[PDB]
Design a binder for these strands. Structure first.
Lengths: 108, 411, 423, 80, 98, 94, 76, 78
DNA sequence: TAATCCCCTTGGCGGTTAAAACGCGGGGGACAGCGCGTACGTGCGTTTAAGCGGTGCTAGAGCTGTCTACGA
DNA sequence: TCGTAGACAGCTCTAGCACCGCTTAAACGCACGTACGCGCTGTCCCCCGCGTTTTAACCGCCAAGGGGATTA
């Protein structure tokens, strides 16, 4: 064929939209699917994951360290608001726990 | 002069609402027959000290120490009994009415046989220590435990007091009255009525909770029924005893001796009675040295103490094959055991209801599955008690067992 | 007293039959003390209750004593006499024990009805003068009856008279009122002249202090025209101007002696001093919540200091301690306070001249009063209200010296770089 | 063989302090063992059916994917 | 030395623990029971390592939220000591076992 | 080295546009690669049932964004609406 | 069966929609299902709290019972 | 508006819930919880109608709403 | 799609130190009991607005031509 | 690159939509007796705190094997 000017490059983004629609044609959820439907969700995911990584970099600044650890994630998401209610049933591998101490557990 | 007199109807107060007797008079003293038991008490002229006419009879005080509280007389018995008296005694009766002020401020005098309490030369009671059963003290608690010898009318049970500190004193001669082998002795008893960890040794006509703060007695008369019940996980066992009267702190009442055993209550015991004497008392059953499940090992002795049969948990397997279920009742959710003739509710409170005394039962329903069934039982005494939180399979087991007991289900 | 004479008998000869008895007209219980039927004045008796097992009941009767008449002052004329505390009778049911037990509580009612507590202010000099401040559509709260009383208010040379439609006169003196305040109907339900008294005056049924006069500006009917809101403006603005002229008339008689300060709704907040969040507002001398019933009127003059409660995370509603000067006056808790109005109420305290404190901590406040009513400087011996602040304690160590992580951390990092694509 | 008692009382206690509680009572131990292992069996039961659906002889971590899909209690990052 | 004040030891414990995440449970003392349980369902079922690792993660993950729920139940109960009552009650909220 | 089509590399770029130097655990890379699929599925099946409900065999981006409005709350949902919208209209411009 | 009366309920239910989207029409029939879903998330919403009150050993109720079980329901 | 939640209707629920002594602040407490439970089930229903591009709201909206809620009961053919 | 295999799982273990368990010393916290004041439930007057029988009222759900344009 | 699902009119018609009486059953509030929430308790008791024993779980190292991935 010609140069592989990507649909995602025509979206200006990273996710493999042709391979995403390939994945869409695996579960086969309707007889047809609009061409922007793989574009739209991939754009949504690339947006939200960037915010997740932005909060993870803030948690790394809180760590004052270099490599992102999985304990950061509850530091991100279990300190979040929309994701925290949104991913409440989600359990987090190597996430740790939030520091949550009761004032009744404190002396005079 | 005249030699006798007769009233076959007059009372004499003996520890509460004691009924009629039989006054007979004589020129030296009094022949008072009991019209109930035939008990004749006699008084002579060397005994007489005091008599005062109150609201009505010969309220006499003799040199027996006795307080002869004759009553059931009419007003001018004041004359006619004195018409038998007049020649000798050197004693008349005042119209006292020792006190009617209704004002608390007075002094207690420990009487030599009685207990007098005065409101400024005006007394209200002079009560012998025969009239009390047992006694504790406190600060400022002065506990006068009164146990009636079964009169169906009004019977006083307890009077406590505001006595001041009794500076350099206490309840001295108050605590100076009647004295109310250890056959076996127990160790580390998980007490639930009262709560704690105390022990009970076994005495010839009774038992005794020895403890650290309190110390209680268990008469053989006061028992009602051996109850033997488990916990539903069968890791524990409920050692409950039907009793009458309850024992008290003055504030609460212990109608049922509840104890907690485990399933692990397994040891040998050694009885402090001889090998012929264990069956001289027992009769062929309970030997000197047996062993095993202490929930059963102790209760075998407890049966021959009560001389009354065994309460056995039923074979009714409710939900998940359990012999009961819990239910929300009286600031608690506790189990309900079915029995041969009743139901028993552990734990706070313990409530037994016999089958025959039930007038009827009834249900009440929410809508959802989650224990919306609400089941109440009305007895034939007019009382009805309500036990919520029943599931649908719990209803199935319940309803089938109630129908197996052929009970009136109001619906 | 209970009795005086043997001929002062019971109403029935009971000990021939051993029946319970109360003498009502002499106000005494008569019970056999093991056959000794003794009377007892009800003013020496606490109370009574009942238990029953089977038919066998138990009627305890607690009697007044140190411990029952007090907690072990005396209006009781012997400190160290031996008394009684209680008795307990047992009978059965083959009954009247309960049936006389129910007669006991109204004897307690009738005695304290007979023995109540017994403010009579001066008879207000009514003067139908030239500047007679009179105004209409005025309702009073608390009312004379349970019904909402209607009338007018008439100010005089020594106070106010709420002359009702029935002609009932409500004499409200100058020296009686502590806090005469005015809240407009600005987005309100009423427009209120509150008159916080200093004396609970006997009128209607009770003795009242916080009495308010109001005119409703409500809206909800249960029976787009732009004349409904204009009629609402005619009923609000064109009548509140006459209400301000009535303020001018009552202060044509006081000449700002009995003032009417302006509400501070910029500092007013929906808080709960009466445990219901209504619009408090400061005024020139009063943080007042007279917008609804009952009106919270606190004297700002008798306030020692201010402790803010619950100054802590996840607490949008926090509380506050009005540490009073008069600790005999019970310390009230203004509650459910917004975090945005923290510093406004602080600046209000800067206008109230109070060096204040904050905190999250709480303690039994009546216990702190009993700590401080024994000595006004005795709680000040405890560091004062720096006891609200922390002071720490001794320990071994925090022991977080080796607070580190994986020294041999995982090598999970840059996965790769070799990649490709298709269509 | 008695491996229900493989979990130890101090490990239980370290879980409880990682659970952030204050005072121990020793009755909770077998209670937690029972609450644990039955829920584990709830996972293990349909987990076996997944490898049976794969017709294999070895349990993988693809199984717990669909197990937590039934649970709504999912973790992440465990496709390998 | 001086046995430590109540809670302060455990407060240092939980402060040490709230940062930490890794396994409080041994591998093969857990695996032994897991392989024991799996044979009760069916024989001839091998494991891989990593699934067991994820399950040893997941069981702790299930238990820990239960633990804090039980702790909040004690906060309701307003007593220092933990209670057997709550968990069932928590499951009465959670609808797990009836 | 495990050459399967988990994404793992667009993450390896979009961190570097917001944090150009921060190390990452590749563990968390797998966490997020799972996390992609975890939301892909709940988009996809509910899009399938919505395509069933109107009885319409096509799935365009309005059918996506209605499930987005369902599945994501608030302003970040509106942000994702904007960012998907500009991308879909960008490929409309292509 | 049915406890909530119809019209003051459903006028408030219609009052909700304008916060989301004004000027909309409705099934009268759908409102009854909303009543059912409401009273569904009333009774079991209360029973657990009554269980909290019996764990509070109280006859009366408190909002501590309310806020607890909803978190135990994972609602917050 | 929300003031229409009458205290005796609340007590009908509470005795249907089997609660006998009821604190008065629970009345105003539950009113917001009502609206919380409302708004989720109303928002997606609005979303359903807007996707269906209609002027009217169906009960099938409630059907598919409570499916996403995890709060699905039945009674009208669904 | 039947052979092929190498890329995974296993039986029991040499070492030995940090972790598991009983107990002694002692101490920390539930708890039922004592009041003691208190607020929601019952009886009841009062409002009074809501379910229903009836009005007039009109704008929205529904299916049929159509021909087509974006997915296949 | 052939194809058919559906947006654009269009008719049908009907499910509601907003009120006016009837009336009539349901909610508001006043007064009040009280069952139950609340503060102090005192008593016993049940885990810390190591102490000591132990002990067994994990690294380095061994072979044995086996069954699922991987190739036309």
């Amino acid at each position: 064929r010609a140069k592989a000017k990507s649909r995602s490059s025509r979206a200006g983004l990273q996710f493999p939209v042709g391979r995403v629609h390939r994945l869409l044609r695996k579960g086969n959820y309707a007889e047809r699917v609009g061409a922007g439907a793989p574009v739209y969700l991939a754009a949504v995911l690339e947006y939200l994951t960037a915010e997740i990584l932005e909060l993870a970099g803030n948690a790394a600044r809180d760590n004052k360290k270099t490599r992102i650890i999985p304990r950061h994630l509850q530091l991100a998401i279990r300190n979040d608001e929309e994701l925290n209610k949104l991913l409440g049933r989600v359990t987090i591998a190597q996430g740790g726990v939030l520091p949550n101490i009761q004032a009744v557990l404190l002396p005079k | 002069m005249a030699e006798t007199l007769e009233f076959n109807d007059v009372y004499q107060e003996v520890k509460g609402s004691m009924n009629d007797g039989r006054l007979r008079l004589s020129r030296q003293g009094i022949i008072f027959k009991n019209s109930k038991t035939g008990k004749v008490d006699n008084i002579q002229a060397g005994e007489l000290t005091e008599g005062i006419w109150r609201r009505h009879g010969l309220k006499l005080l003799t040199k027996n120490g006795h307080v002869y509280k004759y009553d059931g007389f009419r007003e001018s018995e004041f004359e006619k009994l004195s018409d038998f008296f007049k020649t000798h005694y050197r004693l008349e009766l005042m119209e006292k009415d020792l006190c009617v002020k209704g004002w608390n401020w007075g002094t207690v005098k420990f009487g030599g046989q009685l207990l007098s309490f005065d409101i400024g030369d005006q007394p209200v009671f002079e009560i012998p220590l025969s009239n009390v059963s047992q006694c504790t003290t406190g600060k400022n608690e002065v506990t006068l435990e009164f146990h009636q010898n079964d009169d169906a009318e009004v019977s006083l049970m307890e009077v406590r007091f505001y006595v001041p500190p009794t500076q350099x004193x206490x309840x001295x001669x108050x605590x100076x009255x009647x004295x109310x082998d250890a056959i076996c002795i127990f160790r580390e008893l998980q007490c639930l009525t009262p709560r704690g960890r105390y022990d009970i040794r076994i005495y010839p006509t009774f038992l005794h909770l020895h403890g650290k703060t309190f110390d209680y007695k268990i008469p053989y008369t006061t028992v009602l029924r051996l109850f033997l019940l488990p916990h539903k996980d069968q890791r524990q066992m409920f050692f409950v005893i039907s009793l009458d009267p309850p024992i008290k702190q003055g504030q609460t009442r212990y109608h049922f001796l509840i104890l907690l055993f485990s399933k692990d209550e397994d040891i040998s015991l050694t009885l402090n009675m001889n090998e012929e004497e264990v069956e001289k008392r027992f009769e062929g059953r309970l030997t000197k040295n047996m062993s095993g499940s202490l929930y059963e090992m102790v209760s075998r002795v407890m049966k021959a103490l009560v001389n009354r049969k065994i309460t056995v948990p039923g074979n009714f397997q409710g939900h998940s094959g359990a012999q009961c279920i819990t239910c929300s009742y009286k600031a608690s959710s506790g189990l309900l055991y079915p029995l041969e003739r009743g139901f028993i509710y552990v734990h706070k409170p313990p409530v037994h209801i016999r089958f025959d005394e039930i007038s009827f039962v009834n249900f009440a329903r929410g809508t959802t599955t989650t224990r919306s069934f609400d089941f109440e039982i009305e007895t034939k005494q007019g009382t009805q008690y309500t036990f919520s939180s029943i599931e649908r399979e719990e209803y199935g087991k319940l309803f089938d067992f109630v129908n197996a007991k052929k009970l009136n289900i109001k619906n | 007293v209970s009795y005086k004479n043997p001929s002062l008998m019971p109403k029935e000869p009971h000990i021939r039959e051993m029946k319970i008895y109360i003498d009502k007209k002499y106000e005494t219980v008569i019970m056999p003390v093991f056959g000794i039927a003794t009377p007892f004045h009800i003013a020496t008796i606490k109370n009574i209750s009942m238990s029953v097992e089977g038919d066998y009941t138990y009627l305890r009767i607690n009697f007044y004593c140190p411990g029952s008449a007090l907690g072990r002052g005396n209006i009781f004329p012997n400190p160290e006499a031996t008394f009684v505390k209680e008795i307990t009778y047992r009978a059965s049911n083959i009954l009247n024990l309960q049936n006389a037990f129910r007669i006991i509580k109204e004897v307690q009612k009738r005695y304290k009805x007979x023995x109540x507590x017994x403010v009579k202010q001066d008879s207000l000099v009514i003067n139908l003068n030239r500047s007679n401040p009179k105004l209409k559509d005025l309702y009073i709260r608390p009312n004379i009856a349970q019904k909402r009383m209607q009338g007018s208010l008439e100010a005089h040379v020594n106070g106010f008279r709420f002359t009702s439609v029935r002609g009932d006169k409500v004499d409200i003196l100058y020296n009686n009122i502590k806090h005469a305040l005015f809240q407009p109907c600005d987005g309100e339900m009423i427009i209120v002249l509150h008159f916080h008294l200093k004396n609970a005056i006997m009128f209607g049924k009770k003795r009242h202090t916080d009495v308010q006069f109001y005119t409703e500006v409500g809206e909800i009917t249960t029976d787009d025209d732009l004349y409904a809101e204009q009629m609402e403006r005619e009923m609000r603005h064109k009548l509140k101007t006459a209400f301000k002229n009535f303020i001018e008339k009552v202060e044509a008689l006081t000449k700002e002696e009995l003032e009417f300060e302006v509400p501070f709704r910029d500092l007013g907040f929906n808080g709960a001093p009466y445990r219901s969040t209504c619009l408090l507002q400061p005024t020139s001398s009063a943080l007042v919540n007279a917008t609804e019933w009952p009106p919270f009127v606190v004297t700002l003059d008798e306030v020692e200091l201010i402790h803010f409660e619950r100054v802590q995370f996840h607490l949008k509603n926090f509380d506050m301690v009005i540490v009073y000067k008069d600790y005999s006056k019970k310390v009230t808790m203004i509650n459910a306070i917004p975090v945005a109005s923290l510093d406004p109420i602080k600046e209000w305290l800067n206008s109230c001249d109070l060096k204040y404190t904050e905190g999250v901590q709480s303690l039994n406040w009546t216990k702190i009063m009993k700590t401080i009513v024994d000595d006004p400087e005795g709680f000040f011996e405890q560091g004062g209200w720096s006891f609200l602040x922390x002071x720490x304690x001794x320990x071994x160590x925090x022991x977080x010296x080796x607070x580190x992580x994986x020294x041999x951390x995982x090598x999970x990092x840059x996965x790769x770089x070799x990649x490709x694509x298709x269509x | 063989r008695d491996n229900i008692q493989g979990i130890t009382k101090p490990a239980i206690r370290r879980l409880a302090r990682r659970g952030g509680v204050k005072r121990i009572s020793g009755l909770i131990y077998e209670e937690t063992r029972g609450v644990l292992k039955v829920f584990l069996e709830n996972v293990i039961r349909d987990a076996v059916t997944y490898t049976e659906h794969a017709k294999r002889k070895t349990v993988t971590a693809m199984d717990v994917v669909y197990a937590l899909k039934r649970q709504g209690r999912t973790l992440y990052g465990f496709g390998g | 030395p001086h046995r430590y004040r109540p809670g302060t030891v455990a407060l240092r414990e939980i402060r040490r623990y709230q940062k930490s995440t890794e396994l409080l449970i041994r591998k093969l003392p857990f695996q032994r029971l897991v392989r024991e349980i799996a044979q009760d369902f069916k024989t001839d079922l091998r494991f891989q390592s990593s699934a067991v690792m994820a399950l040893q993660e997941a069981c702790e993950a299930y238990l820990v939220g239960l633990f804090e729920d039980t702790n909040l139940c004690a906060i309701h109960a307003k007593r220092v000591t933990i209670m057997p009552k709550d968990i069932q009650l928590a499951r009465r909220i959670r609808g797990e076992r009836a | 080295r495990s050459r399967k089509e988990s994404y793992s590399v667009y993450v390896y770029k979009v961190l570097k546009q917001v944090h150009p130097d921060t190390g990452i655990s590749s563990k968390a890379m797998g966490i997020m690669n799972s996390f992609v699929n975890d939301i892909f599925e709940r988009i996809a099946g509910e899009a399938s049932r919505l395509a069933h409900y109107n009885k319409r065999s096509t799935i365009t981006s309005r059918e996506i964004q209605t499930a987005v409005r369902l599945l994501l709350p608030g302003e970040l949902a509106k942000h994702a609406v904007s960012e998907g919208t500009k991308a879909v209209t960008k490929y409309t411009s292509s | 069966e049915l406890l909530i009366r119809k019209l003051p309920f459903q006028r408030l239910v219609r009052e909700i929609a304008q916060d989301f989207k004004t000027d909309l029409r409705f099934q009268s029939s759908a409102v009854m299902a909303l009543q059912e879903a409401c009273e569904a998330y009333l009774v079991g919403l209360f029973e657990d709290t009554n269980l909290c009150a019996i764990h509070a050993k109280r006859v009366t109720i408190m909002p501590k019972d309310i806020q607890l079980a909803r978190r135990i329901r994972g609602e917050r």
